[PDB]
């Protein structure tokens, strides 16, 4: 029930005693969905953010910084794979990661599965620059639970799986869980790479340590956390765990540098120097990566 | 019960107790204990802008103090301009090569309040290798002879020529360098103006600071001497005996910090 000229306020128990607030210039969508609360608004036009999307009260995408996380998830993973022909996105309803994955000419086909069909609908309508990808004939966009999708996928189906979900607290709770990640390992081909929505070193450092140990133990050969700067996420950063099925692979140095591909100059955040830099963690977090 | 920092966006931390809140002769100083259920601890703000929190002050203090000193061949005489809380000084003093550090901050009330409410940061203010002055830094460098300092660190809220002049030929200057998200145009202008004033190289080092607006800040690392590549450590911290006492900075972070997002890379490359 947001109102134009009102303020949107983001607080949350997973981060007690801090809040981020954006003045609302224009409400575009604000309603319960089958699965979560979807809010879209145009932010103050004197500010840089543009249109904002929140899911259950938490900002997911803004026009001004959406390229960071989408470019990092899409390119760090695909530039770590020797020939990524078939790709799966779990979540990713807004289309950002799909847009970056489809930059790559090796990609033959990408499946995307998001549980909330209204997220796709609202992104088509209000984020055309993020959502254009969803209509690509190289994509198959499905509405469905990613958990069920992967359980019903045959062994060895994908080169890369990217898990672009919400918090562990919402409809995305088991996509930080155990039959799920074993399923991801199983549906990956031998040289398979997985990357996930990775949580913050400031708020979630214990979860990150736990996830990384347990991804390795379920049977991934290596797991390395890449940090990135996202100004609208709590505490200004988020990371992704980049995981290799195959042993002997060093994801922290690009296997297929983007500089050699024809779109490198269209990117606004990612390049090979940012890719390598993203695996250097502050000392207090470095034990994640060794 | 919230401290609000502010077009059309705000960032708030909940206040548990107000420790200090007065104008100073120079600026508005607010110090508070934040929500004990969150991590931030005691928080200091100046003119409505968060400057220091217990939880994350190590970042900016380690990056400024060590990025600069690890880029100098032998840093023995160091000047800090601003830095009244003590945190850059604490990092500077870890280095065995440092004979002496002068620190000059315009606001003595900041020093006083830091000794009172941030003792893990301001203990450094009473080190015998340090001299703390209360005074304007512009007037201080104007009155400093040529080739006085190996390193000048500008940790603030005719000058850059004075800085260039008071540095020795191998001198390194670093500053509080602003945000690539909020101030990108100012960073490009400053990086040109510092090169024009005479510094031979300027490179911006980016860092993750949760309590600064949009979660990052940076520092311009400027070398008086031509041909110096500050983006790789000249004297790696891993070879010094305090490397493991640090919570943020190491040689990998040093290198990484000069890798800028494509949209900002024209600052460095
Ligand atoms: C919007 S995207 C996050 C913003 C960065 N692109 C988060 C998506 O994860 C979906 N999500 C959450 N749980 C699931 C499950 N179980 N399966 C698939 N997609 C999911 C959710 O509907 C969002 O669209
Ligand atoms: C708080 S410190 C920055 C916080 C990260 N340690 C910023 C200091 O710079 C001082 N400052 C501001 N202007 C000047 C001048 N002109 N000279 C010296 N010190 C100054 C100001 O009083 C703050 O204490
Ligand atoms: C620590 N901190 C933040 O993370 C701010 C506010 O809380 C947020 C919550 C959700 C997203 C982004 C947020 O940015 C901060 C607090 C006060 C001042 C500056 C920074």
mmCIF file with all atom_site columns, C-alpha atoms in Angstrom, chain A residues 21-154:
data_model
loop_
_atom_site.group_PDB
_atom_site.id
_atom_site.type_symbol
_atom_site.label_atom_id
_atom_site.label_alt_id
_atom_site.label_comp_id
_atom_site.label_asym_id
_atom_site.label_entity_id
_atom_site.label_seq_id
_atom_site.pdbx_PDB_ins_code
_atom_site.Cartn_x
_atom_site.Cartn_y
_atom_site.Cartn_z
_atom_site.occupancy
_atom_site.B_iso_or_equiv
_atom_site.pdbx_formal_charge
_atom_site.auth_seq_id
_atom_site.auth_comp_id
_atom_site.auth_asym_id
_atom_site.auth_atom_id
_atom_site.pdbx_PDB_model_num
ATOM 1   C CA . UNK A 1 21  ? 14.953 4.404   2.615   1.00 0.00 ? 21  UNK A CA 1
ATOM 2   C CA . UNK A 1 22  ? 14.044 5.620   -0.889  1.00 0.00 ? 22  UNK A CA 1
ATOM 3   C CA . UNK A 1 23  ? 11.439 8.321   -1.577  1.00 0.00 ? 23  UNK A CA 1
ATOM 4   C CA . UNK A 1 24  ? 8.767  6.958   -3.952  1.00 0.00 ? 24  UNK A CA 1
ATOM 5   C CA . UNK A 1 25  ? 8.078  9.141   -7.020  1.00 0.00 ? 25  UNK A CA 1
ATOM 6   C CA . UNK A 1 26  ? 5.605  6.679   -8.538  1.00 0.00 ? 26  UNK A CA 1
ATOM 7   C CA . UNK A 1 27  ? 4.104  3.320   -7.476  1.00 0.00 ? 27  UNK A CA 1
ATOM 8   C CA . UNK A 1 28  ? 3.959  0.852   -10.427 1.00 0.00 ? 28  UNK A CA 1
ATOM 9   C CA . UNK A 1 29  ? 3.013  -2.384  -8.720  1.00 0.00 ? 29  UNK A CA 1
ATOM 10  C CA . UNK A 1 30  ? 2.396  -3.230  -5.103  1.00 0.00 ? 30  UNK A CA 1
ATOM 11  C CA . UNK A 1 31  ? 0.579  -6.465  -4.234  1.00 0.00 ? 31  UNK A CA 1
ATOM 12  C CA . UNK A 1 32  ? 0.860  -10.069 -2.915  1.00 0.00 ? 32  UNK A CA 1
ATOM 13  C CA . UNK A 1 33  ? 1.701  -12.597 -5.526  1.00 0.00 ? 33  UNK A CA 1
ATOM 14  C CA . UNK A 1 34  ? 1.094  -16.341 -5.117  1.00 0.00 ? 34  UNK A CA 1
ATOM 15  C CA . UNK A 1 35  ? 4.525  -16.674 -3.519  1.00 0.00 ? 35  UNK A CA 1
ATOM 16  C CA . UNK A 1 36  ? 5.754  -13.321 -2.150  1.00 0.00 ? 36  UNK A CA 1
ATOM 17  C CA . UNK A 1 37  ? 5.161  -9.551  -1.834  1.00 0.00 ? 37  UNK A CA 1
ATOM 18  C CA . UNK A 1 38  ? 6.066  -7.754  -5.177  1.00 0.00 ? 38  UNK A CA 1
ATOM 19  C CA . UNK A 1 39  ? 6.689  -3.986  -5.137  1.00 0.00 ? 39  UNK A CA 1
ATOM 20  C CA . UNK A 1 40  ? 7.852  -1.888  -8.125  1.00 0.00 ? 40  UNK A CA 1
ATOM 21  C CA . UNK A 1 41  ? 8.293  1.915   -8.056  1.00 0.00 ? 41  UNK A CA 1
ATOM 22  C CA . UNK A 1 42  ? 9.968  4.724   -9.793  1.00 0.00 ? 42  UNK A CA 1
ATOM 23  C CA . UNK A 1 43  ? 12.412 6.313   -7.223  1.00 0.00 ? 43  UNK A CA 1
ATOM 24  C CA . UNK A 1 44  ? 13.165 10.063  -6.839  1.00 0.00 ? 44  UNK A CA 1
ATOM 25  C CA . UNK A 1 45  ? 14.130 11.326  -10.327 1.00 0.00 ? 45  UNK A CA 1
ATOM 26  C CA . UNK A 1 46  ? 16.748 13.683  -8.713  1.00 0.00 ? 46  UNK A CA 1
ATOM 27  C CA . UNK A 1 47  ? 18.407 10.430  -7.418  1.00 0.00 ? 47  UNK A CA 1
ATOM 28  C CA . UNK A 1 48  ? 20.232 7.973   -9.672  1.00 0.00 ? 48  UNK A CA 1
ATOM 29  C CA . UNK A 1 49  ? 18.299 4.710   -8.916  1.00 0.00 ? 49  UNK A CA 1
ATOM 30  C CA . UNK A 1 50  ? 15.435 4.800   -11.450 1.00 0.00 ? 50  UNK A CA 1
ATOM 31  C CA . UNK A 1 51  ? 12.920 2.019   -11.173 1.00 0.00 ? 51  UNK A CA 1
ATOM 32  C CA . UNK A 1 52  ? 13.230 -0.238  -8.077  1.00 0.00 ? 52  UNK A CA 1
ATOM 33  C CA . UNK A 1 53  ? 11.932 -3.766  -7.434  1.00 0.00 ? 53  UNK A CA 1
ATOM 34  C CA . UNK A 1 54  ? 11.553 -5.279  -3.971  1.00 0.00 ? 54  UNK A CA 1
ATOM 35  C CA . UNK A 1 55  ? 10.462 -8.808  -3.011  1.00 0.00 ? 55  UNK A CA 1
ATOM 36  C CA . UNK A 1 56  ? 8.943  -9.179  0.523   1.00 0.00 ? 56  UNK A CA 1
ATOM 37  C CA . UNK A 1 57  ? 10.277 -5.708  1.399   1.00 0.00 ? 57  UNK A CA 1
ATOM 38  C CA . UNK A 1 58  ? 13.823 -6.232  0.115   1.00 0.00 ? 58  UNK A CA 1
ATOM 39  C CA . UNK A 1 59  ? 15.296 -4.508  -2.904  1.00 0.00 ? 59  UNK A CA 1
ATOM 40  C CA . UNK A 1 60  ? 16.249 -6.944  -5.651  1.00 0.00 ? 60  UNK A CA 1
ATOM 41  C CA . UNK A 1 61  ? 16.947 -4.850  -8.710  1.00 0.00 ? 61  UNK A CA 1
ATOM 42  C CA . UNK A 1 62  ? 17.381 -1.160  -9.532  1.00 0.00 ? 62  UNK A CA 1
ATOM 43  C CA . UNK A 1 63  ? 17.974 0.358   -12.849 1.00 0.00 ? 63  UNK A CA 1
ATOM 44  C CA . UNK A 1 64  ? 21.230 2.020   -11.758 1.00 0.00 ? 64  UNK A CA 1
ATOM 45  C CA . UNK A 1 65  ? 23.177 -1.030  -10.338 1.00 0.00 ? 65  UNK A CA 1
ATOM 46  C CA . UNK A 1 66  ? 21.446 -4.178  -11.698 1.00 0.00 ? 66  UNK A CA 1
ATOM 47  C CA . UNK A 1 67  ? 24.328 -4.733  -14.143 1.00 0.00 ? 67  UNK A CA 1
ATOM 48  C CA . UNK A 1 68  ? 26.801 -5.627  -11.314 1.00 0.00 ? 68  UNK A CA 1
ATOM 49  C CA . UNK A 1 69  ? 25.281 -8.759  -9.975  1.00 0.00 ? 69  UNK A CA 1
ATOM 50  C CA . UNK A 1 70  ? 23.901 -9.865  -13.385 1.00 0.00 ? 70  UNK A CA 1
ATOM 51  C CA . UNK A 1 71  ? 27.231 -9.408  -15.109 1.00 0.00 ? 71  UNK A CA 1
ATOM 52  C CA . UNK A 1 72  ? 29.155 -11.051 -12.297 1.00 0.00 ? 72  UNK A CA 1
ATOM 53  C CA . UNK A 1 73  ? 26.903 -14.123 -12.045 1.00 0.00 ? 73  UNK A CA 1
ATOM 54  C CA . UNK A 1 74  ? 26.660 -14.523 -15.818 1.00 0.00 ? 74  UNK A CA 1
ATOM 55  C CA . UNK A 1 75  ? 30.278 -13.947 -16.860 1.00 0.00 ? 75  UNK A CA 1
ATOM 56  C CA . UNK A 1 76  ? 32.313 -15.281 -13.905 1.00 0.00 ? 76  UNK A CA 1
ATOM 57  C CA . UNK A 1 77  ? 30.522 -18.642 -14.358 1.00 0.00 ? 77  UNK A CA 1
ATOM 58  C CA . UNK A 1 78  ? 30.513 -18.870 -18.196 1.00 0.00 ? 78  UNK A CA 1
ATOM 59  C CA . UNK A 1 79  ? 34.079 -17.500 -18.486 1.00 0.00 ? 79  UNK A CA 1
ATOM 60  C CA . UNK A 1 80  ? 35.126 -20.360 -16.133 1.00 0.00 ? 80  UNK A CA 1
ATOM 61  C CA . UNK A 1 81  ? 33.670 -23.098 -18.367 1.00 0.00 ? 81  UNK A CA 1
ATOM 62  C CA . UNK A 1 82  ? 35.506 -24.309 -21.534 1.00 0.00 ? 82  UNK A CA 1
ATOM 63  C CA . UNK A 1 83  ? 32.392 -24.512 -23.752 1.00 0.00 ? 83  UNK A CA 1
ATOM 64  C CA . UNK A 1 84  ? 29.171 -23.602 -22.092 1.00 0.00 ? 84  UNK A CA 1
ATOM 65  C CA . UNK A 1 85  ? 26.434 -24.833 -24.472 1.00 0.00 ? 85  UNK A CA 1
ATOM 66  C CA . UNK A 1 86  ? 23.517 -25.551 -22.163 1.00 0.00 ? 86  UNK A CA 1
ATOM 67  C CA . UNK A 1 87  ? 22.807 -23.364 -19.200 1.00 0.00 ? 87  UNK A CA 1
ATOM 68  C CA . UNK A 1 88  ? 20.186 -23.443 -16.404 1.00 0.00 ? 88  UNK A CA 1
ATOM 69  C CA . UNK A 1 89  ? 19.084 -20.349 -14.365 1.00 0.00 ? 89  UNK A CA 1
ATOM 70  C CA . UNK A 1 90  ? 17.134 -21.003 -11.193 1.00 0.00 ? 90  UNK A CA 1
ATOM 71  C CA . UNK A 1 91  ? 15.136 -17.900 -10.203 1.00 0.00 ? 91  UNK A CA 1
ATOM 72  C CA . UNK A 1 92  ? 16.319 -14.972 -12.263 1.00 0.00 ? 92  UNK A CA 1
ATOM 73  C CA . UNK A 1 93  ? 12.768 -14.017 -13.135 1.00 0.00 ? 93  UNK A CA 1
ATOM 74  C CA . UNK A 1 94  ? 13.685 -10.432 -14.095 1.00 0.00 ? 94  UNK A CA 1
ATOM 75  C CA . UNK A 1 95  ? 15.831 -11.653 -16.906 1.00 0.00 ? 95  UNK A CA 1
ATOM 76  C CA . UNK A 1 96  ? 19.185 -9.974  -15.954 1.00 0.00 ? 96  UNK A CA 1
ATOM 77  C CA . UNK A 1 97  ? 21.356 -13.036 -15.676 1.00 0.00 ? 97  UNK A CA 1
ATOM 78  C CA . UNK A 1 98  ? 19.736 -14.518 -18.821 1.00 0.00 ? 98  UNK A CA 1
ATOM 79  C CA . UNK A 1 99  ? 20.639 -11.327 -20.724 1.00 0.00 ? 99  UNK A CA 1
ATOM 80  C CA . UNK A 1 100 ? 24.305 -11.734 -19.768 1.00 0.00 ? 100 UNK A CA 1
ATOM 81  C CA . UNK A 1 101 ? 24.419 -15.497 -20.418 1.00 0.00 ? 101 UNK A CA 1
ATOM 82  C CA . UNK A 1 102 ? 22.936 -14.932 -23.943 1.00 0.00 ? 102 UNK A CA 1
ATOM 83  C CA . UNK A 1 103 ? 25.817 -12.509 -24.742 1.00 0.00 ? 103 UNK A CA 1
ATOM 84  C CA . UNK A 1 104 ? 27.923 -15.657 -25.133 1.00 0.00 ? 104 UNK A CA 1
ATOM 85  C CA . UNK A 1 105 ? 27.938 -17.176 -28.636 1.00 0.00 ? 105 UNK A CA 1
ATOM 86  C CA . UNK A 1 106 ? 28.813 -20.651 -27.297 1.00 0.00 ? 106 UNK A CA 1
ATOM 87  C CA . UNK A 1 107 ? 25.385 -20.817 -25.583 1.00 0.00 ? 107 UNK A CA 1
ATOM 88  C CA . UNK A 1 108 ? 22.930 -22.949 -27.613 1.00 0.00 ? 108 UNK A CA 1
ATOM 89  C CA . UNK A 1 109 ? 20.194 -23.032 -25.079 1.00 0.00 ? 109 UNK A CA 1
ATOM 90  C CA . UNK A 1 110 ? 19.375 -21.638 -21.669 1.00 0.00 ? 110 UNK A CA 1
ATOM 91  C CA . UNK A 1 111 ? 16.576 -22.858 -19.436 1.00 0.00 ? 111 UNK A CA 1
ATOM 92  C CA . UNK A 1 112 ? 15.249 -20.400 -16.861 1.00 0.00 ? 112 UNK A CA 1
ATOM 93  C CA . UNK A 1 113 ? 12.876 -21.492 -14.109 1.00 0.00 ? 113 UNK A CA 1
ATOM 94  C CA . UNK A 1 114 ? 11.348 -18.996 -11.699 1.00 0.00 ? 114 UNK A CA 1
ATOM 95  C CA . UNK A 1 115 ? 8.630  -19.965 -9.235  1.00 0.00 ? 115 UNK A CA 1
ATOM 96  C CA . UNK A 1 116 ? 6.836  -16.573 -9.492  1.00 0.00 ? 116 UNK A CA 1
ATOM 97  C CA . UNK A 1 117 ? 5.277  -15.899 -12.861 1.00 0.00 ? 117 UNK A CA 1
ATOM 98  C CA . UNK A 1 118 ? 4.259  -12.369 -11.802 1.00 0.00 ? 118 UNK A CA 1
ATOM 99  C CA . UNK A 1 119 ? 7.993  -11.521 -11.431 1.00 0.00 ? 119 UNK A CA 1
ATOM 100 C CA . UNK A 1 120 ? 8.509  -12.188 -15.150 1.00 0.00 ? 120 UNK A CA 1
ATOM 101 C CA . UNK A 1 121 ? 5.291  -10.303 -15.982 1.00 0.00 ? 121 UNK A CA 1
ATOM 102 C CA . UNK A 1 122 ? 6.263  -7.195  -14.006 1.00 0.00 ? 122 UNK A CA 1
ATOM 103 C CA . UNK A 1 123 ? 9.815  -7.202  -15.391 1.00 0.00 ? 123 UNK A CA 1
ATOM 104 C CA . UNK A 1 124 ? 8.543  -7.297  -18.966 1.00 0.00 ? 124 UNK A CA 1
ATOM 105 C CA . UNK A 1 125 ? 6.327  -4.343  -18.163 1.00 0.00 ? 125 UNK A CA 1
ATOM 106 C CA . UNK A 1 126 ? 8.620  -2.210  -16.027 1.00 0.00 ? 126 UNK A CA 1
ATOM 107 C CA . UNK A 1 127 ? 12.175 -3.324  -16.639 1.00 0.00 ? 127 UNK A CA 1
ATOM 108 C CA . UNK A 1 128 ? 12.396 -3.739  -20.477 1.00 0.00 ? 128 UNK A CA 1
ATOM 109 C CA . UNK A 1 129 ? 16.174 -3.324  -20.500 1.00 0.00 ? 129 UNK A CA 1
ATOM 110 C CA . UNK A 1 130 ? 16.575 -6.280  -17.982 1.00 0.00 ? 130 UNK A CA 1
ATOM 111 C CA . UNK A 1 131 ? 13.694 -8.383  -19.340 1.00 0.00 ? 131 UNK A CA 1
ATOM 112 C CA . UNK A 1 132 ? 14.260 -8.335  -23.143 1.00 0.00 ? 132 UNK A CA 1
ATOM 113 C CA . UNK A 1 133 ? 16.217 -11.559 -22.924 1.00 0.00 ? 133 UNK A CA 1
ATOM 114 C CA . UNK A 1 134 ? 13.142 -13.534 -21.713 1.00 0.00 ? 134 UNK A CA 1
ATOM 115 C CA . UNK A 1 135 ? 11.670 -13.507 -25.263 1.00 0.00 ? 135 UNK A CA 1
ATOM 116 C CA . UNK A 1 136 ? 14.893 -14.857 -26.824 1.00 0.00 ? 136 UNK A CA 1
ATOM 117 C CA . UNK A 1 137 ? 14.266 -18.101 -28.810 1.00 0.00 ? 137 UNK A CA 1
ATOM 118 C CA . UNK A 1 138 ? 17.570 -19.368 -27.339 1.00 0.00 ? 138 UNK A CA 1
ATOM 119 C CA . UNK A 1 139 ? 15.813 -19.288 -23.914 1.00 0.00 ? 139 UNK A CA 1
ATOM 120 C CA . UNK A 1 140 ? 13.027 -21.450 -22.510 1.00 0.00 ? 140 UNK A CA 1
ATOM 121 C CA . UNK A 1 141 ? 11.379 -19.552 -19.649 1.00 0.00 ? 141 UNK A CA 1
ATOM 122 C CA . UNK A 1 142 ? 9.281  -21.767 -17.230 1.00 0.00 ? 142 UNK A CA 1
ATOM 123 C CA . UNK A 1 143 ? 7.260  -20.881 -14.147 1.00 0.00 ? 143 UNK A CA 1
ATOM 124 C CA . UNK A 1 144 ? 8.004  -23.576 -11.475 1.00 0.00 ? 144 UNK A CA 1
ATOM 125 C CA . UNK A 1 145 ? 9.846  -24.522 -8.353  1.00 0.00 ? 145 UNK A CA 1
ATOM 126 C CA . UNK A 1 146 ? 13.598 -24.908 -9.087  1.00 0.00 ? 146 UNK A CA 1
ATOM 127 C CA . UNK A 1 147 ? 13.700 -27.680 -6.482  1.00 0.00 ? 147 UNK A CA 1
ATOM 128 C CA . UNK A 1 148 ? 11.238 -29.845 -8.401  1.00 0.00 ? 148 UNK A CA 1
ATOM 129 C CA . UNK A 1 149 ? 12.802 -28.809 -11.730 1.00 0.00 ? 149 UNK A CA 1
ATOM 130 C CA . UNK A 1 150 ? 16.259 -30.060 -10.850 1.00 0.00 ? 150 UNK A CA 1
ATOM 131 C CA . UNK A 1 151 ? 14.936 -33.266 -9.235  1.00 0.00 ? 151 UNK A CA 1
ATOM 132 C CA . UNK A 1 152 ? 13.212 -34.098 -12.502 1.00 0.00 ? 152 UNK A CA 1
ATOM 133 C CA . UNK A 1 153 ? 16.231 -33.188 -14.688 1.00 0.00 ? 153 UNK A CA 1
ATOM 134 C CA . UNK A 1 154 ? 18.346 -36.093 -16.018 1.00 0.00 ? 154 UNK A CA 1
#
